[PDB]
Structure 1
Amino acid sequence: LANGTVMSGSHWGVFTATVENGRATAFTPWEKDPHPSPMLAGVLDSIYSPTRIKYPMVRREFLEKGVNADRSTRGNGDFVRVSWDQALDLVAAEVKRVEETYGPEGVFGGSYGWKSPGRLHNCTTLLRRMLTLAGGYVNGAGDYSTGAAQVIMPHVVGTLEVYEQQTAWPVLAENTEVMVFWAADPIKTSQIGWVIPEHGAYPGLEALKAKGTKVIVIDPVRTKTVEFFGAEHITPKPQTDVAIMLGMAHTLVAEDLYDKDFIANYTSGFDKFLPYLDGETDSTPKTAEWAEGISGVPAETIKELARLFESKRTMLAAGWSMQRMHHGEQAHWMLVTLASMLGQIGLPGGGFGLSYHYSGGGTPSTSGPALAGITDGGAATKGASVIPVARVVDMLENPGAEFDFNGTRSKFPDVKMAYWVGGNPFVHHQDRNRMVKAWEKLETFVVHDFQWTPTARHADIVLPATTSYERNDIETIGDYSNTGILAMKKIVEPLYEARSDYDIFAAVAERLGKGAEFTEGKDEMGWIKSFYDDAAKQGKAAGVQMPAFDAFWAEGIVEFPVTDGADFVRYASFREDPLLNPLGTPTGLIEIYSKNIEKMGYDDCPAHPTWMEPLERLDGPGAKYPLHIAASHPFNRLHSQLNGTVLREGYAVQGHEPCLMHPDDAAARGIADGDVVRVHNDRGQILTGVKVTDAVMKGVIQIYEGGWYDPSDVTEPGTLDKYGDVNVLSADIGTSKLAQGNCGQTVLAEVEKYTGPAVTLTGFVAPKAAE
């Protein structure tokens, strides 16, 4: 058996494995990693944990009755083990059946998910590759992270903006006077990357603190970001940031401080927004006093923040949680508007940034080539075919109905089958109880995972995939920085009967009479060497030298150099000469008023930043429930990933997902730290374990997304979730008609001490038949 050490990487970093007798015993972080993530140990554990899927399983119910099966028992664990040959025959037969009977419109292949890094083993791309061969599929658009923001930004600043390189960290260190983290926790969220992360924010953040720069954090939770800086902490009532931004704009007009020259030469439509702000259209002057009434943040604090921002070089780095809410589009729309009023856009250290908390945005880019991998075919091949990702349940329930998106109207397709790889829709999608009944509409549900997630438990057919550590691959290090290219080397042998997604899709393409079209005559290393060679020819033309494939593989990593990437300032050419370098909007300037959006006529998305009542907010007129659940991203998980590993022991409370509650709120309900609580609203009910702290502001509770749903009974509508899936409580509604994003953080609920029967958690052990 093997003994040695092997370097690879993941979403958490670059590391070195220790193999002892064919088993990975340790994962040590890369030596050049400036801030390793404590979650690496969990990543190793996920290879071997008890919820690891061993064999191909077919739902008992589906085996005997097929399309006539009772679809309400999905998730109950009654699975039949089958040979791989049987399972593959079944999946291909079923795919072809739905394509002949229903067409391409009957197959939903959006398969949303964070999967695993790697240009060869990209499961989601691989599934679309096979589905393209099978006749076609219905795809998904946008994502759950910036659902609202990515659609509205292009109407305002000209591009997406959220997934674009930021003004470099170094530039901030020498120039920024005030750093504002608005609804962002960069210490927490910078641990992972979409591709191998370099952890570039950490050094950037330390340079700021060493420099003495003033840092202001505007968030309901007392995060690690607040603690690292010992920052000034503004705690708004969740969902009231737009009011605050309006209040701050009012002061600025009220005391005549805003930058009139900036507004005049770089923006458009401001004079159509002024009336609104002054109260001339609705009789409600958007003052600090007015904003205080809605946000709960002292009026004078609001006036002082606005003055301090106008007289110092300020950077507003805003998170994305505040756009994962009803009317999400106004959050960043108002922040650009407020940034525009201060006049620092395009100045070194000033402006705003939407990616400083995500995937190393702000880390200087190198000049290395770009890496590419397997594609799904489409650019060389030949109802609606694309739906906004968060409208998947609506689709299912309303086949044929119309829907609005970015100014157009389309019809939902009539889907009969869902194929999901590398994602966890039974943990990530809002309103679990709505989705559970909606899934009954689907004839067949096929899932690939290596962990028995709530999504896998609910499948008709489940196939065991391997991790990234049981195969070979190549991937980039740094989403923005392009630090290097990594060889993701095989560590151990595929466990039990696990197989790569690629191998499973090759096999299914073969039964559709299309194998050579899927594989292209190449094997694993064949594909990897062709990606590397492509980048190497690219690098060569740009004067970046790169080893030959085997040389590169022997080293395992290639790093590229940094030339002028540490001097980059977002929006500097635009500010320097706006006529020569205009924005990509109709007017070519920052659009505070949108004629385009006004033409659309959407009630829930006016033509300028506007404050509207959300479906439900804390202390809102007629709100039924008292506490706001900050259903944010987890510290010790990557969404739902790593929940079924040893890491769960350090945060679970009585075996449940933790719930951070304020001492006053706990007293009132006679709740003691450590208790099991019932969290419920009109949508659903969950159990969690309480941690009492004054970190969370009064009126708000913290239950992170990612909890593995554990229903007491799948046949009982509204069954209590035993573990703690926060999406049992969220509502499933589009943000507005413009983007149709998800409102996953628009949740209100009530908490009580659980005094019911004892409960047995069953989600962290595999199904009896799967042992």
Structure 2
Amino acid sequence: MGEVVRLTNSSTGGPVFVYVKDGKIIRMTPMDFDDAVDAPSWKIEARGKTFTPPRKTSIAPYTAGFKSMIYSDLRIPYPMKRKSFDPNGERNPQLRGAGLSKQDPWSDYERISWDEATDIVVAEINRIKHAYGPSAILSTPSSHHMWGNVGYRHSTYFRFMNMMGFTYADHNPDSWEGWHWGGMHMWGFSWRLGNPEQYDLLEDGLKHAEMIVFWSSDPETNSGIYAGFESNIRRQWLKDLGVDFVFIDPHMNHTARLVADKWFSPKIGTDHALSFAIAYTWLKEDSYDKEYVAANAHGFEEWADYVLGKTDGTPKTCEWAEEESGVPACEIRALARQWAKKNTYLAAGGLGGWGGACRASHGIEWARGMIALATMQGMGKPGSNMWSTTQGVPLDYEFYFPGYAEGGISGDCENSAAGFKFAWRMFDGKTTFPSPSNLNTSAGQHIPRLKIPECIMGGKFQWSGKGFAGGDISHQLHQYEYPAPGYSKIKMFWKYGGPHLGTMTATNRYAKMYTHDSLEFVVSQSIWFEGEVPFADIILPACTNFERWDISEFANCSGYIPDNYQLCNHRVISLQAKCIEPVGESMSDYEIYRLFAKKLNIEEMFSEGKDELAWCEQYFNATDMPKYMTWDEFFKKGYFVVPDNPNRKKTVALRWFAEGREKDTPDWGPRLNNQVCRKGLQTTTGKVEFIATSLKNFEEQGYIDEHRPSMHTYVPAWESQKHSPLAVKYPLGMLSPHPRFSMHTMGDGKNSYMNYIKDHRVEVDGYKYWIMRVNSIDAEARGIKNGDLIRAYNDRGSVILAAQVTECLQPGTVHSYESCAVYDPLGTAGKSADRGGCINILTPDRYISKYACGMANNTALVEIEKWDGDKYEIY
């Protein structure tokens, strides 16, 4: 009926040009800049060369094949109701997931109208609120979400929920675990949940780098986050400058496979043995920055005595480290010596912080170990810092555009970073108003996402901290309980998405909780019929960001990752055009909430009479965009490339700290009250505390915690091959990092094109099985051959996988990405082997430490064998 039109939109894998014709998406591609209307890029002159980025953006694999997700046959087609669920009769809680237990999920549901679905949910909401109160209504989306600032969970979800309930299952700082519960006590950075700032490090590195140690870092795979492959050319520049790349990772990751000069494969949970031996070498050879340490460290003398083995009787030698990790002593010492004499950047994690190693049983000591090494070598000075090569791009930090974490239309200052700046720009206290919550606050009631199963099935729990405790170093130490004083236990559960079986810990427990009799009602507001969705009583179809209007900036999260758009080669602001009408009978989350608001008699307050596009324009006017173009002009162009700011003075991450002067970067901390005269780290002493003062206070107050000592020491990982009794039955060490070809659950399954990728899933007898990588030696010992179906198991469950025999793992170590989107039990749900590929069924649910209430997934002991075909209904 018409011609092809090129529109714009974006995703968690980067911005794209969307070609549409007759209401159908033809293709989605990376973006080409038009030098006639798009501002010039930045340039960096270093070591006799001029570096400038390509005039184009890049995308991730899962974004390249995203069209197959939009038009997926597993897309929820219309509102659905569980047949065995009668609101006014037998609710049959025990029959939730019955379809799944008989390998026929869809058979459990029947089609219903939007009007009837919403009436049923409203009747439940009102009944529960008047009988138990809003706290009885549990709700939680999950960590990630379709791209788009206005419709993002911190925005639309919170604006509505805050006006309706509710008890939030606040998220644990998954991405940051070790840095959050451990590193924070050592160097502060609470506002970044333990991660360091990275401002202007690219130019610093191009001019001074001689070596980069990628520790638990796979920049190519993770891109930091949301940045496609923007940093690929940068490591290419470094490589051509002669910079050496060393990788320390149990698995020879994708970046290592591409540019590694040397690769170390430590056994799971033993990285801190390597950091202690490196420090030991530096102390014995006097090869570190003593001046820097003398001025910027606290408790270093005592720590040094520990490293030297004076206090515990065990010198942390490279030989001692080899016996612990399996990495040759000579190589550890060689790296140590080279690191000391060359300008070396420590790329801990893919972002500059993070790293799979941080969310493992040794996560706390790994993070502190990374800080210790960077500190000893004088981080902040030219040629020495913590930099993962993904951030640090010289973008205009002075131009302001909100990341999704700043709240959008919710203005929630306690559960989003709206309070820093956006809330004040977006709301005027006259014509438009925020939606605060008096329940999702410390003095109200929330439960830990990691312990939802225990709260539902046990009816009681006690823990430390509330979600992301970034306010101050000690906020995570505050004690909470469920049910909270005066509040009600959960009666209803409103799920937004359903990825937990593949993303949390020892996940069979999440499947078991749905059938508990205390759960009177479960609603799932999702996009695809997968994961946990088939356990709900009512299912509401939401649409992707390609079916609604929104606005956003390439990789811009902001908030707990201030100015992270510096992950990209250009700051790109784009209008997310509604490319097509919603698929099936789905609708945007905002429209769903608008419909509920109407039935709850709060429509005016929630919507303020605005549709998604009206909110986008208001949002737009609250940014610095009006300085360059009007809404009308922006809407027409579709995207804007922020101009370069050539003359701004460079402020390299931590240089101010290294030089003992006032903080001068654009970072959001430390807060003035956490510093003396605007100098020093957020820590009490303002220095890097090898003996954390906050933890010393905590332990002296009576909170004894063996696995989180105030002093950074070699605490044996509780789930490692030589320190866990479990190793006898399950000798193999498994690490389960983020999926290479999917943004967590968003990409896998759904009959998407990504399932045809050779290294994603392997088709065997018509079924595409998840992959587990095994060293040829371990495979041979078990009669396992490439492509064979194997069973990975431990006390927590069984998972059927396709084996990939490789040399990319030290013998004894196995690897399998987490975040499988498919939950496909061979028997009863939560009690049998899964063939979908949910590796997190096997990971430990035990907290990193007694009070460090984070996930320790990446250290799991398992055993594998050729699958005999049984369903193993024994869990």
With the length of structure 2 as denominator, give the TM-score of the two structures: 0.81
CA–CA distance in structure 2, aligned partners of residues 124 and 584 of structure 1: 27
User: Which of 432, 435, 439 is matched with 2:510 structurally?
Assistant: 435
User: Which of 626, 636, 641 is matched with 2:746 structurally?
Assistant: 641
Q: Which runs of 5+ in 2 are unaligned?
A: 33-54, 100-104, 350-354, 414-433, 466-475, 484-488, 557-563, 663-676, 700-704
CA–CA distance in structure 1, aligned partners of residues 500 and 573 of structure 2: 31
User: Which of 750, 761, 786 is matched with 1:652 structurally?
Assistant: 761
Q: Secondary structure at the match of 2:221?
A: helix
CA–CA distance in structure 2, aligned partners of residues 496 and 546 of structure 1: 39
Corresponding position: 1:324 with 2:399: no
Residue 641 of structure 2 corresponds to: 559
Residue 425 of structure 2 corresponds to: none
Amino acid at match of 1:168: L
Q: Does the 8 Å CA contact 2:16/2:30 hold for their aligned counterparts?
A: yes
Of 137-146 and 328-337, deviating more is 137-146
Residue 494 of structure 1 corresponds to: 582
Q: Closer, same or farther in 2 for the Cα pair 1:3/1:494, shift >3 Å?
A: farther
Matches within 5 A, 1:298-317: 298-317=328-347
Q: Secondary structure at the match of 1:63?
A: coil
Structure 1 residues 400-431: Cα deviation after superposition (integer angstroms, max 9, x where no partner): 43223433221123222222224522221111
User: Which of 422, 434, 450 is matched with 1:390 structurally?
Assistant: 450
Residue 501 of structure 2 corresponds to: 426
Residue 3 of structure 1 corresponds to: 3
Q: Does the 8 Å CA contact 2:198/2:652 hold for their aligned counterparts?
A: no
Amino acid at match of 2:3: N
CA–CA distance in structure 2, aligned partners of residues 599 and 28 of structure 1: 54
Of 250-259 and 526-535, deviating more is 250-259
User: Which of 593, 601, 610 is matched with 2:713 structurally?
Assistant: 610
Residue 370 of structure 1 corresponds to: 401
User: Which of 46, 57, 61 is matched with 1:38 structurally?
Assistant: 61
The CA deviation at 1:714 is: 6.0
User: Which of 673, 681, 686 is matched with 1:583 structurally?
Assistant: 681
Matches within 5 A, 1:101-250: 101-123=131-153, 125-159=155-189, 160=192, 161-162=194-195, 164-190=197-223, 192-193=225-226, 197=227, 199-250=229-280
User: Which of 532, 539, 542 is matched with 1:465 structurally?
Assistant: 542
CA–CA distance in structure 1, aligned partners of residues 862 and 271 of structure 2: 20
Structure 1 residues 688-743: Cα deviation after superposition (integer angstroms, max 9, x where no partner): 11122212221112211122343335636521112211011112121123431111
CA–CA distance in structure 2, aligned partners of residues 38 and 328 of structure 1: 29
Amino acid at match of 1:365: L
CA–CA distance in structure 2, aligned partners of residues 352 and 163 of structure 1: 8
Corresponding position: 1:571 with 2:654: yes
Q: Secondary structure at the match of 1:39?
A: helix
The CA deviation at 1:57 is: 0.5
Q: Secondary structure at the match of 2:532?
A: helix
Residue 672 of structure 2 corresponds to: none
CA–CA distance in structure 1, aligned partners of residues 592 and 619 of structure 2: 21
CA–CA distance in structure 1, aligned partners of residues 585 and 210 of structure 2: 57
CA–CA distance in structure 1, aligned partners of residues 632 and 172 of structure 2: 38
Identity, % of aligned positions: 29
CA–CA distance in structure 2, aligned partners of residues 200 and 130 of structure 1: 35
The CA deviation at 1:470 is: 0.8
CA–CA distance in structure 2, aligned partners of residues 713 and 93 of structure 1: 36
Q: Does the 8 Å CA contact 2:156/2:409 hold for their aligned counterparts?
A: yes
Residue 380 of structure 2 corresponds to: 346
Amino acid at match of 2:660: D
Residue 762 of structure 1 corresponds to: none
CA–CA distance in structure 2, aligned partners of residues 375 and 749 of structure 1: 45
Structure 1 residues 642-697: Cα deviation after superposition (integer angstroms, max 9, x where no partner): 11202102232121011222111111111111111111111100111112221222
CA–CA distance in structure 2, aligned partners of residues 666 and 198 of structure 1: 34
Q: Closer, same or farther in 2 for the Cα pair 1:125/1:390, shift >3 Å?
A: farther
Q: Does the 8 Å CA contact 1:138/1:386 hold for their aligned counterparts?
A: yes
CA–CA distance in structure 1, aligned partners of residues 120 and 198 of structure 2: 45
Residue 565 of structure 2 corresponds to: 481
The CA deviation at 1:605 is: 0.7
CA–CA distance in structure 2, aligned partners of residues 143 and 173 of structure 1: 32
Residue 416 of structure 1 corresponds to: 491
Q: Does the 8 Å CA contact 1:37/1:191 hold for their aligned counterparts?
A: no
CA–CA distance in structure 1, aligned partners of residues 196 and 284 of structure 2: 35
Q: Closer, same or farther in 2 for the Cα pair 1:102/1:715, shift >3 Å?
A: farther
Residue 520 of structure 1 corresponds to: 608
Corresponding position: 1:732 with 2:845: yes
Structure 1 residues 226-248: Cα deviation after superposition (integer angstroms, max 9, x where no partner): 13224211111121001111111
Q: Secondary structure at the match of 1:440?
A: coil
CA–CA distance in structure 1, aligned partners of residues 724 and 376 of structure 2: 31
Q: Does the 8 Å CA contact 2:365/2:715 hold for their aligned counterparts?
A: no
Q: Closer, same or farther in 2 for the Cα pair 1:569/1:19, shift >3 Å?
A: same
Residue 530 of structure 2 corresponds to: 453
CA–CA distance in structure 2, aligned partners of residues 736 and 526 of structure 1: 47
Amino acid at match of 1:456: V
Of 556-565 and 646-655, deviating more is 556-565
Amino acid at match of 2:533: A
Q: Does the 8 Å CA contact 2:210/2:243 hold for their aligned counterparts?
A: yes
Of 137-146 and 45-54, deviating more is 137-146
Corresponding position: 1:669 with 2:782: yes
Q: Does the 8 Å CA contact 2:732/2:812 hold for their aligned counterparts?
A: yes
Q: Closer, same or farther in 2 for the Cα pair 1:565/1:471, shift >3 Å?
A: farther
The CA deviation at 1:224 is: 2.3
Q: Secondary structure at the match of 1:749?
A: strand
CA–CA distance in structure 2, aligned partners of residues 144 and 437 of structure 1: 22
CA–CA distance in structure 2, aligned partners of residues 260 and 281 of structure 1: 22
With the length of structure 1 as denominator, give the TM-score of the two structures: 0.92
CA–CA distance in structure 2, aligned partners of residues 142 and 392 of structure 1: 12
Amino acid at match of 2:511: V
Q: Closer, same or farther in 2 for the Cα pair 1:736/1:647, shift >3 Å?
A: same
Q: Secondary structure at the match of 2:610?
A: coil
Q: Closer, same or farther in 2 for the Cα pair 1:744/1:520, shift >3 Å?
A: same
CA–CA distance in structure 1, aligned partners of residues 771 and 865 of structure 2: 14
Q: Does the 8 Å CA contact 2:138/2:166 hold for their aligned counterparts?
A: no
Of 615-624 and 512-521, deviating more is 615-624
CA–CA distance in structure 1, aligned partners of residues 510 and 537 of structure 2: 16
Of 363-372 and 675-684, deviating more is 363-372
Q: Closer, same or farther in 2 for the Cα pair 1:565/1:35, shift >3 Å?
A: farther
Q: Does the 8 Å CA contact 2:771/2:801 hold for their aligned counterparts?
A: yes
CA–CA distance in structure 2, aligned partners of residues 99 and 123 of structure 1: 23
Aligned length: 745
CA–CA distance in structure 2, aligned partners of residues 97 and 377 of structure 1: 28
Of 666-675 and 159-168, deviating more is 159-168
CA–CA distance in structure 1, aligned partners of residues 657 and 21 of structure 2: 57
Amino acid at match of 1:547: M
Amino acid at match of 2:862: A
Of 288-297 and 13-22, deviating more is 13-22
Corresponding position: 1:741 with 2:854: yes
Amino acid at match of 1:50: D
Q: Secondary structure at the match of 2:382?
A: coil
Amino acid at match of 1:607: S
